[PDB]
């Protein structure tokens, strides 16, 4: 079942993030558990856990467009063996429920263009890459 992670869940959340990066051949940094523990306790953010087979990491940040925050689904992951079983749907449905408690004006997610499975999942559940008749692109600089 889906539940809101507590500080003591930081080890499981960090373990899942490590599998996410390992699956996609991405090096992971040290101290994931200690940082998740501090984030879950203090920051304007939360983690949802689907047992220990999936998680969603959501951050909340201010916007002049709404009284509430803008939510960002920074990480959404379901373990490969438990995919295509409604877990991702349940996690995302709970994300919308939780951010609605904060009166979040909008949910945002960054997605790779080549991840067609994830894009179709998000489009099937009400998210769009289109604003004002244009695709939206994410630009970054790692520092």
> Residue 69 has which token pair?
């925050």
Which of its own copies, ligand ACO, none lies near 131, with the C-beta cut-off 5 to 8 A by kind? its own copies
Q: What angle do CA 33, 37, 38 make, to 5 degrees?
A: 120
Confirm or reject binding of residue 15 to ligand ACO (CB under 6 A). Answer: no
Q: Smallest gap, in angstroms, from Cβ of residue 99 to its own copies?
A: 8
Distances (CA, A) of 41 to 5, 48, 73, 108: 10, 14, 18, 23
Closer residue to ligand ACO in complex, CB, 37/73? 73
By CB under 6 A, what part of segment 90-129 binds ligand ACO? 109-111, 115, 118, 120-121, 124
How far apart CA 111 and CA 113 sit, in angstroms, is: 6
Contact 105, 68 (CB under 8 A): yes
Binding site for its own copies (CB under 8 A): 14, 17, 24-26, 29, 31-32, 35-36, 38-39, 42-45, 57, 59-67, 70, 72, 74, 96, 99-100, 104-115, 119, 122-123, 126-129, 131-143
């Amino acid at each position: 079942e889906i539940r809101v992670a507590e500080v003591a869940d930081a080890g499981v959340v960090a373990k899942l993030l490590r599998d996410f990066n390992t699956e996609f051949d991405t090096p992971v940094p040290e101290g994931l558990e200690e940082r998740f523990a501090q984030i879950i306790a203090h920051d304007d953010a939360f983690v949802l856990l689907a047992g220990d087979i999936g998680f969603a990491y959501v951050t909340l940040r201010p916007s002049p467009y709404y009284d509430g925050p803008v939510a960002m689904l920074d990480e959404l992951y379901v373990a490969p063996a438990h995919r295509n079983r409604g877990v991702g749907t349940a996690l995302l449905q709970r994300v919308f429920e939780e951010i609605r408690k904060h009166s979040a004006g909008e949910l945002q997610i960054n997605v790779d263009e080549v991840d067609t499975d994830a894009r179709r999942f998000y489009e099937r559940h009400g998210l769009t890459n289109i604003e004002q008749g244009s695709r939206m692109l994410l630009y970054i600089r790692e520092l």
